[PDB]
């Protein structure tokens, strides 16, 4: 039996581009087209990540075929605004769409692994929330495979409460949120590859996360993600995540609140002269923040900013990129910094409306759904 179908070109190109987004660099090259009863199934797999999408399509003959992924994607992107007829003959697949005609070689379906089954559904979260929270913590994940445990996003579930955490040893990002459990409260924790998950999340209905239910959570070693017409899986990391909670300070000896946009722009300005962008200096005292960078061989820069500051004067230094990474992940108008010494971690959190002032402190840490914890660098 030879596959043959007509499909709307937008729907088809959209599906292919989504599947091809999760495609290995170098037989697994191909994506799998499958015509069924309900319509057309399009999928890809590389033993690590699977992705399958169902699209409406006038199936004229059942069958399936493995065709080159990157090529099929490029071709489908370039097609005119006319419907796409696909037809399989021998070792060739034909694709016509208006005036244009393509004939691609088919790949050996014989060696092509079946997609893994998604685990039982665990919970459901809103898409925009899911995308924000993953995006927020992914910025802190390690990107170096020699330390695999740092390349994941930690997902701790306790009933309706989900904690997301990631770290690269220099910053630590933790995002709490609440979802709807679909199979009773569960208590578990898994470690999901950061890069993959951040890509899945960057791709509006609702997001159903599947890890299993009961005590069998993570036992498939797979994270299933499902939305309308879209199914995907990701192999979990069995690496051991470090204990992070004990790093969050209970109190601060100084606190600062300031506008995020104003601070971010001043940092990027001042750091223009910093050596290797290694560090920017922050001097807090009274009602002013003084940023500074550079040396007299390339050039110096400084800039004063009004800041809401409480505690004793403090000069602390950071990697400017790690700092703006944190600032840019807060998604609030203002930031509150929590400090202790110049050589201990600094808390960055969204400011509430209470934040700003007076007192000598110490200052109890705020409860927030998001925190970005940043290690300083040593001043010279």
């Amino acid at each position: 039996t030879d596959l043959k179908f007509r499909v709307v070109r937008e729907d088809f190109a959209d599906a292919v581009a989504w599947v091809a987004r999760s495609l290995p660099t170098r037989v697994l090259a191909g994506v799998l087209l499958t015509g069924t009863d309900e319509g057309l199934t399009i999928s890809g797999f590389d033993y690590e990540v699977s992705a399958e999408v169902k699209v409406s399509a006038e199936i004229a003959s059942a069958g399936s075929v493995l065709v080159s992924g990157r090529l099929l994607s490029d071709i489908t992107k370039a097609l005119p605004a006319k419907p796409v007829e696909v037809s399989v003959e021998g070792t060739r697949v034909s694709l016509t769409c208006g005036s244009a005609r393509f004939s691609l070689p088919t790949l050996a379906v014989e060696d092509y692994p079946a997609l893994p089954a998604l685990p039982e559904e665990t919970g459901v979260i809103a898409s925009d929330l899911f995308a924000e929270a993953i995006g927020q913590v992914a910025v802190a994940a390690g990107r170096d495979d020699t330390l695999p445990m740092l390349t994941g996003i930690r997902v701790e579930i306790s009933g309706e409460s989900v904690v997301l955490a990631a770290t690269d040893r220099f910053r630590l990002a933790v995002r709490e949120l609440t979802w709807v459990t679909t199979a009773g409260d569960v208590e578990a924790a898994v470690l999901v590859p950061a890069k993959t998950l951040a890509e899945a999340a960057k791709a509006g209905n609702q997001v159903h996360l599947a890890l299993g239910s009961g005590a069998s959570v993570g036992k498939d070693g797979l994270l299933g993600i499902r939305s309308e017409g879209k199914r995907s899986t990701t192999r979990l990391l069995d690496a051991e995540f470090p204990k992070f909670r004990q790093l969050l300070p209970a109190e601060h000896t100084a606190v600062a609140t300031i506008g995020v946009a104003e601070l971010t722009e001043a940092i990027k300005r001042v750091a223009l002269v910093a050596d290797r962008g290694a560090q920017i200096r922050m001097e807090f005292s009274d009602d002013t923040l003084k940023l500074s960078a550079g040396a007299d061989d390339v050039g110096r820069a400084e800039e004063d900013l009004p800041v809401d500051f409480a505690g004793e004067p403090l000069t602390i230094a950071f990697n400017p990129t790690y700092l703006t990474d944190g600032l840019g992940s807060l998604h609030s108008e203002r930031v509150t910094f929590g400090f202790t010494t110049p050589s201990r971690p600094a808390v960055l959190r969204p400011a509430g409306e209470d934040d700003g002032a007076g007192g000598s402190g110490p200052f109890p840490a705020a409860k927030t759904d998001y925190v970005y914890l940043l290690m300083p660098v040593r001043l010279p």
């Binding site: 740092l150 770290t167 040893r169 910053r171 630590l172 204990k243 050589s343 290690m375």
Partner: peptide, 10 residues
Amino acid sequence: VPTLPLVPXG
């Protein structure tokens, strides 16, 4: 360039 006091990890 110290690390966070992660245990283990630093």
